[PDB]
Amino acid sequence: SNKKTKLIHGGHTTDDYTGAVTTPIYQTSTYLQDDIGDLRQGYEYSRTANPTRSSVESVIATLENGKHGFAFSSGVAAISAVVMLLDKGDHIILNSDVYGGTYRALTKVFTRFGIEVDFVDTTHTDSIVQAIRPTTKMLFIETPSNPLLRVTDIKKSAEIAKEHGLISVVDNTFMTPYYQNPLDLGIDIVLHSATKYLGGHSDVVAGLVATSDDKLAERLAFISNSTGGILGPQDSYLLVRGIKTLGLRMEQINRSVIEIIKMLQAHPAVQQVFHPSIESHLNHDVHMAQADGHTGVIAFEVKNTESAKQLIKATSYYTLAESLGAVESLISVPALMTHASIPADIRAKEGITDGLVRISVGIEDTEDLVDDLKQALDTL
Amino acid sequence: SNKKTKLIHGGHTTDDYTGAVTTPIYQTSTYLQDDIGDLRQGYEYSRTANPTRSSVESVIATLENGKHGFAFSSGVAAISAVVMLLDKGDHIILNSDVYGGTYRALTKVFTRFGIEVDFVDTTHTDSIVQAIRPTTKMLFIETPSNPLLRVTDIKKSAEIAKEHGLISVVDNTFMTPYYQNPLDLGIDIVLHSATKYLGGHSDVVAGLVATSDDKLAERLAFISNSTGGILGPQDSYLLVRGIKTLGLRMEQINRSVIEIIKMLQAHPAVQQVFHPSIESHLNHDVHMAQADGHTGVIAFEVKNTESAKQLIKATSYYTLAESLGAVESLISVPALMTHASIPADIRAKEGITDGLVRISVGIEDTEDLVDDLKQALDTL
Amino acid sequence: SNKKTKLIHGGHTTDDYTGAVTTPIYQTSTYLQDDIGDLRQGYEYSRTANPTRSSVESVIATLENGKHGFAFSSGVAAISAVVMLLDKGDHIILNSDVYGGTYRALTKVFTRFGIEVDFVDTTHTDSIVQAIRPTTKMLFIETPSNPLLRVTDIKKSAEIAKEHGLISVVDNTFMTPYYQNPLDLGIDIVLHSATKYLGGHSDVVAGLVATSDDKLAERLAFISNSTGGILGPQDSYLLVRGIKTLGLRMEQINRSVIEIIKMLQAHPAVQQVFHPSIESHLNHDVHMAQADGHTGVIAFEVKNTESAKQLIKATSYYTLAESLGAVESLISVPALMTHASIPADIRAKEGITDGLVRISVGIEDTEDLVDDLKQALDTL
Amino acid sequence: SNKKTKLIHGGHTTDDYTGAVTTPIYQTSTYLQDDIGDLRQGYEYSRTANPTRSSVESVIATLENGKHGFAFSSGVAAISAVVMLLDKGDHIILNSDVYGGTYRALTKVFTRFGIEVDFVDTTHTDSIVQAIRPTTKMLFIETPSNPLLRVTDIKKSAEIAKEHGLISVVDNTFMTPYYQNPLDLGIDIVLHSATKYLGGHSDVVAGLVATSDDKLAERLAFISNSTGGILGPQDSYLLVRGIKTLGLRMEQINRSVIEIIKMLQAHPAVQQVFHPSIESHLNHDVHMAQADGHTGVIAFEVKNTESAKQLIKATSYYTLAESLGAVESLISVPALMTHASIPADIRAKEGITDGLVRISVGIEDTEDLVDDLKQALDTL
Ligand SMILES: *Cc1c(COP(=O)(O)O)cnc(C)c1O
Ligand SMILES: *Cc1c(COP(=O)(O)O)cnc(C)c1O
Ligand SMILES: *Cc1c(COP(=O)(O)O)cnc(C)c1O
Ligand SMILES: *Cc1c(COP(=O)(O)O)cnc(C)c1O
Ligand code: NA
Ligand code: NA
Ligand code: NA
Ligand code: NA
Ligand code: NA
Ligand code: NA
Ligand code: NA
Ligand code: NA
Ligand code: NA
Ligand code: NA
Ligand code: NA
Ligand code: NA
Secondary structure, rough: HHHHHHHHHHOOOOOOOOOOOOOEOOOOOOOEEEOOOOOOOOOOEEOOOHHHHHHHHHHHHHHOOOOOOEEEOOHHHHHHHHHHOOOOEEEEEEEEEOOOOHHHHHHHHHHHOOOEEEOOOOOHHHHHHHHHHOOEEEEEEEEOOOOOOOOOOOOHHHHHHHOOOOOOEEEEEOOOOOOOOOHHHHOOEEEEEEEOOOOOOOOOOEEEEEEEOOHHHHHHHHHHHOOOOOOOHHHHHHHHHOOHHHHHHHHHHHHHHHHHHHHHHHHOOOOOOOOOOOOOOOOHHHHHHHHOOOOOOOEEOOOHHHHHHHHHHHHHOOOEEEOOOOOOEEEHHHHOOOOOOOHHHHHHOOOOOOOOOEEEEEOOOOHHHHHHEEEHHOOO | HHHHHHHHOOOOOOOOOOOOOOOOOOOOOEEEEEEEEEOOOOEOOOOOHHHHHHHHHHHHHOOOOEEEEEEEEHHHHHHHHOOOOOOOOEEEEOOOOOOOHHHHHHHHHHHHHHOOOEEOOOOHHHHHHHHHOOOOOEEEOOOOOOOOOOOOOHHHHHHHHOOOOOOEEEEEEOOOOOOOOHHHHHOOOOEEEEEEEEEOOOOOEEEEEEEHHHHHHHHHHHHHHOOOOOHHHHHHHHHHHHHHOOOOOOOOHHHHHHHHHHHHHOOOOOOOEEOOOOOOOOOOOHHHHHHHHHHHHHHEEOOOHHHHHHHHHHHHOEEEEEEOOOEEEEEEOOOHHHHHHHHHHHHHHOOOOOOOOEEOOOEEEEEEHHHHHHHHHHHO | OOHHHHHHHHOOOOOOOOOEEOOEEOOOOEEEEEEEEOOOOOEEOOOOOOOHHHHHHHHHHOOOOEEEEEOOOHOOOOOOHHOOOOOOOEEEEEEEOOOOOHHHHHHHHHHHHOEEEEEEEEOOOHHHHHOOOOOOEEEEEEOOOOOOOOOOHHHHHHHHHOOOEEEEEOOOOOOOOOOHHHHHHHOOOOEEEOOOOOOOOOOOOOEEEEEHHHHHHHHHHHHHHHHOEEEHHHHHHHHHHOOOHHHHHHHHHHHHHHHHHHHHHHHOOOOOOOHHHHOOOOOOHHHHHHOOOOOOEEEOOOOOOOOOOOOHHHHOOEEEEOOOOOOEEOOOOOOHHHOOOEEEHHHHOOOOOOOOOEEEOOOOOHHHHHHHHHHHHHOO | HHHHHHHHHHOOOOOOOEEOOOEEEOOOOOOEEEEEEEEEEOOOOOOOOHHHHHHHHHHHHOOOOOOOOEEEHHHHHHHHHOOOOOOOOOOOEEEEEOHHHHHHHHHHHHHHHOOEEEEEEOOHHHHHHOOOOOOOEEEEEOOOOOOOOOOOOHHHHHHHHHOEEEEEEEEEEOOOOOOOOOOHOOEEEEEEEEOOOOOOOOOOOEEEEEOOOOOHHHHHHHHHHHHOOEEOOHHHHHHHHHOOHHHHHHHHHHHHHEEEEHHHHHOOOOOOOOOOOOOOOOOOOHHHHOOOOOOOOEEEEOOOOHHHHHHHHOOOOEEEEOOOOOOOHHHHEEHHHOOOOOHHHHHHHHHOOOEEEEOOOOOOOHHHHHHHHHHHHOOO
C-alpha cells in the first residue's frame, strides 16, 4: 500500500523453507540436481542465479514497479551491462554532465568497441531530438545529475525514445525508488548504484537494474551470465537489509536538506546553491512533476579553495570521504576530487569553481547538521 | 620455499594494524581522508581497491610468480576484462575446445563489438602460426581443456606470442598455481575461475588474474575500475581461506585420480579415458614438461546415455552437480548438460558421445572413490 | 550532541588503519605478537577481545552514557553473566513479571547454584524495601515489562539499591538507549537483548551490557572471558550497522504506536489496552519522568482465543512470529505462545487472558498499520 | 565409509530446499509460523535452534559417533554448559594439568556456586578411584593434556565412571574426532574447542559438544537455551567449511610431527621432548590403543628463557601467537605466556621450565618445518 509498507513487505525476502523472516545467505556456487536437468528450485549455478541475489532482484523490481531485477557487482558494472545491449556502430545519447565513471566507461572503454556517444544538454529535450542520428539506439539520462543537480524531463525523454525506437535508460541513483519511478513514466530500464542510498550504510558496492520489458530482461540476463559482473550473496543480503530503512533514511535526509538549504541561502559566505527544491532551479517544476521528494546531494559555492578546505576542517559532523548516500553526512570539493584533471578554465566554465562544495546529507539530527555547517561557514 | 609453505606464508594475509593472523573483512565502500587527496593506506573507494580484495590479489600474484593480481566477480568477468584489453578490429586466437562460457562470451558478446575470433586446434602450435593474421593481438589457451583434456604447449605458445607481438593468456583453472605456472613459461597473463579449485569449497564465484607486466596491469586495473566486475570482500576472504588448503586438496585429488584411472582402464564397461597422465594421451610429454601434477577432471566413455544415468544413480559418493574443484566428487554428462544444443552428429564427431562421463575428483578417501565408481560400473 | 547525531558518530566504528568508514569484520581467533607479551593494539585472543566486538561494546557504552561495554552471544547470556556476579547464598530481587527466559534461567539454572530469588511487584518500590534480606545482593528490574508493560521507578530503585549496598540492574531492552538511560539515573548495570530493537532487523541474536563502574566492569570481563558467552564478529558488525538507524526506527514506531492506541481505545471489539503512554496506566507519570519516548510493544484484550486467531489471520501487515523490535510488525498470543504451561485459571488471574494479543509495532506506514489492524478487528 | 569420505559426506550440510551443496547461512533471529505452534521446519527462535548451527551440530555428532550435537560461542562456553549439568554440593574430578581456561572457570567461577573440584593425576586411573567422594558426579579428562601431553586411559576412565554413576566427559580438542572418539569408548560427553583444529583456520572461536545420551542431551539443550552461549550462524558455517579439510590437515600435521620429533631428539640444544608418539612417553601404549594418530602439539626443553626467545626470533615459519590448530605453525613459551602467574619454583617443579617451548605444527611443507626449526636451534 503506502511506500514505507511496501519497503518492508515488497519483494520476496523470507525463506519459504524454514520460515526465516530474513533472506538466507546462500554462500554457495552450485546445486544438487535430482536428475539431469531437474532443478529443485530452479538453481543450478550461482553465476546464473543465486537465491540471495534473487531476493535483492525481486526487491528492486518491486520497488521500481518493474518485472525483472538484476544485481551487479557495482553501479558501473550495471551500466556496462546495459551498454552491452548495443553493438559496434550503434549510438548513445547521454546527458552532458553524466557521472564521471559513466563518462569514463563510455569514452575510454566502449568507444574502443565502436559504440558512438554524444553528450548533450538534456535539460531541453529538443536537444535530444536534435542529437538523434539514424544509428542512435539508446538514450541514457541521470536526473538530477552530479554535482550541479541538473533536472531532465523523464516522461518527455521516454516519449522521444518511444517515437524514435530507442531503449530509454534512467540512472535513478540520486532519487532512489522511494521518490522517483522512471519505469512508471515510460522508461525502458532503470538502474542504480546501490552503493549509495539503497545499501545506505557505506558497506556494499553494488548495482541494481530493473525493467518491465521481457525481451530487454532476457538480453540483460544473457549479458549478466556471459560477462559475469554479478553481485555476491553476502552483498545481496546487506543490500536487502539496508533497503528496509530506505524510506525512514530518505525522509530524515529530506528534512535536513530543506533546513540546510534555508541556512545556505541566508548565509553571506555562500553564493550559488544547486538543488532541485529551489524554485529558481532550472526544471524545478519538472522535478516536482516526476518526483515526490529530493535527493540529499547539495552543491554550493564558497569563495575559493582555501574557504572550502576551511569548511571541511571546521565541521564536526561532515566527513571528508568519497561516495554519497551514507548514514554519515559527507563533504567533498569536486574541483579537487572529481574534476582535477579538467583544465582549470574549463572547470570554471562548467561551474565547477574552486569553491564549489558538495555535501551528501546523512541522517544526523537536523539542527546539529544545520548548526555545524553554519558555524563552520561563520569561520569564513 | 616449498609449495605447501608458500601457500601458507605467501602473499599478505594478516592485519598489520592489530596483528590478526587472518585478513580482516573490509565490508565497506569508502574511506576517510585526513586531507583532500591524502589516503591513510592508499584506499579511497572500494570499487577501485578494497584491502580484503588486495589480500587475495597479493595471494594469486605470489602463487603464480607475478607482480600484479586482480579479483573479479567470476571467472567469466576475469576473461571479459582480459578480452576488453583489445579493440574493435583486433583478432584473438583461442583453442578450439575452449570452455563453453568463454566461447559464448567471445562469439555472442564481443563479436558484436567488432572483436574477431578464430578457434584452432592448439595441440599443434603451428596451427597457431597458421592462424595468425595481421590484426591478431591475443593468443588465449586453456590447458588441459574441457572435457577431453587436450594439452597445449605453453612455452611454445609464449614464444610464438612474443615473436608476433601477441598478448598471451592462459586459463590455468584446471591445473591451479600449485601444479602449473604459465607466467614462468613466458605467458603474459594467467587467469583462473577461482570458483573451482582455488576457493575449493563450492561456496564462492570468483575470477583471479595475475601478470608480471606493469603496463598490462595498468590496463587491467583501468578496465576493472571502469567496468566494475570486482569481487566483494566476503568472497575475497573465503578465497584466501580456501587457498590455504589448496596443496593438500590437490595432492589428495591426484592420488585418487591415479588410482581411479587404473580402475577405469581395467574396467570392461569403460572404453576411452581422457586425462593427461595417460602416456598415450596426446601431448602427455608436453604436460609433464610444463606441470608437476594433474587436474582432477577425468572424462571416460560408457556405452550410452542410459549407462551414464545408471552410473550416476548407482554411485554413493559422486554427486550430480555443475562445476568442479569441490571437496565433493562431482559427476556429469557433457552431452546432456554442456553440449545439448550442439546437434547430435556433430557432438559425436567431436567425441562428446552420449556415454561420455566427466568426473571431478574430490577429497574423499581414495579407496572409497575407486570402489564406489567400480561397483557402479559393475552394475552396467 | 542530539540523539540522532550521537547514534551516527558515537563510539568507535571506523578503521583507524585504512580509514574505512565502517568497522572491519575481524573474522579471526588470534593475533601475532611482535615479542612475547607485546600486543600491537591490545589484542591477543578473540575470546578475550576482538576489535569488531570492541566496536559494538564502545557503541553501547556511549549510547547508555557508561564507561564499559560487553557483547554476549544472546540477551540471556548477558543476563547470565550479570547473575554470575553473585555467589551461592546471595539473594536477588526481580520484578514479578520478568521475562520468561530470565525467570527460567534464575529458577531452573541459578537456583541449583544456591542463588536465591524473589519476584516482587516493583511498581511500588516499598515492595523492594520489604523484600530485602540480609543476603540480598542484587536488584534486577525490567521496565516496562512483558507483556502488560508494568512500569517501575528506576531512580527510586537505584536509591534503594545504593542505600542497601545492592548491585542495581535494569533490562532496558523494550525502551532502548534512545529513550531511557538507566545509568544516568544511578543504576549500576544496564543490559539489552540486542536481538530486538538494537539490531532491529531480526537477523542477530545478541546481548549488550554497559556500566560506568570500573570494578563491576572488571568482574564482568572476567566472567565473559571465563564462561565465554561472547558475541562473534559478524554479529557484532551487524549490530553496529543496525544501531545506526535506531533513532529513525524508534521514532517511526512511536508515531504508529500513538495512532494505533487511539484506534484500539476506540474500537468496540477491544477491551483493555496495556501501554505506558495511556494516562490511566499505572506509573504513567513515572515512565514519562524516566523516558522521553515509548516502547513499540502493545498488549490489548479481545474476547477469546478464536477472536485472537481471527485477528492474526485477517491482518495483512502483522506477522505471526516470535521476538519483537523487527522492521516488520509482529503479532502473538501470550497465553498460547509464552504462558501456555501456566494453568489457565492462574493465567486469567495474572491478566494473561485467552484473548490477550501482543503486537510489536514495526516501521511500516502508520496509516497502513492502523487501517489493517482496524479492518481485522472489524471482522470480529 | 573411510574417515576422509565421512568428513565430506557425513552430517547434513546441503540445502534440501534449493539443493545448494553448502549449508545456507541463516543470518536470522526468528521464523514465520503458519499457525500458532505450527513450525514449518521446527524453527521458531534462533537462540533455541538455527538451521546453520543445526548443520554444524549434526556434523560433530556424526564425526564423534554420537546422537546429539551442540555448538557454543567458545570452547569454555561448552565446558561451562557441561559443568552446569551439576548442582551446588556436587563434586568433579579433573586431570591435574587441565587447560588453564578450564582451571580458571572451575576454581574462580563455579566454586562460587558450590561446585567442588579436585585435580588429580589421571595417568594412573586408580587416582580417580581414590578421589571419588560420595558427592562426586562428574569425571572430566583431557588427553593428551597441555603442554606436557600427559595421556589418560579413556576406556578405563569410562568404566570407572559407569561403575560409580558419574557423568564422564572428555575434552577431545587436541586429538580431534579424526583420531580419537571417546564416545566409542563409553564416555558420556565429548567436547572440543572448535577454535583450534576443527575450524582449522584461526578465524572462529567456538565450542562443540556431542553425546549419545538422550537425557544428557535434553539437559544440555535446556542449559544452552537458558544461558544462551550459542554459536552464531556465520561462525557455524565457517566451522562446517573448515571441518571438510580436517583429515587432510591432520595427516599433513602428523607427517611433520613425526619428522620434527626425530630432529628434536637428535639435536644437542634440545633436552626433553614431550609427545605421545615417543615410545618412552608415559602411557604411550594407552594412547596408541585409544587413538590412531597424533596431536600436532609438541613441547620440548631448551636451556633457558633467552634460548627460547632466540628460537622464536630465528624461525621463519613458526609464528609467535596464542592458540593452536592453525594452518600456520605456532610457537610459544608456556612459562611466559600461560603460566607466568605461577611462582617460578612451582613452575620448575611441574616441568614448566624457562626453556620449555610449545609448538603447534601447521600444514607447511614438512622439510621446511624441520629445516627451519633445526637451523634456529643451530643458532643456540
Ligand atoms: C502497497 C504494496 C504494493 C503495491 O505498491 P504500489 O505503489 O501501489 O504499486 C506492493 N507490495 C506491497 C508489499 C505493498 O504493501
Ligand atoms: C618459498 C617461498 C617463496 C618463494 O617461492 P618460489 O617458488 O621459490 O618462487 C615465496 N614466499 C614464501 C612465503 C615462500 O615460502
Ligand atoms: C552529542 C554527542 C555526545 C554526547 O552525548 P550526550 O547525550 O550529551 O551525553 C557524544 N558523542 C557524540 C558523537 C555526540 O554527537
Ligand atoms: C562411512 C560413513 C559413515 C559411517 O562411519 P563409521 O566410522 O563406520 O561409523 C557415516 N557417514 C558417512 C557419510 C560415511 O561415509
Ligand atoms: Na514480502
Ligand atoms: Na514501458
Ligand atoms: Na569536517
Ligand atoms: Na605472508
Ligand atoms: Na614475461
Ligand atoms: Na551418484
Ligand atoms: Na565515532
Ligand atoms: Na553510578
Ligand atoms: Na496477519
Ligand atoms: Na551429508
Ligand atoms: Na555410552
Ligand atoms: Na619465528
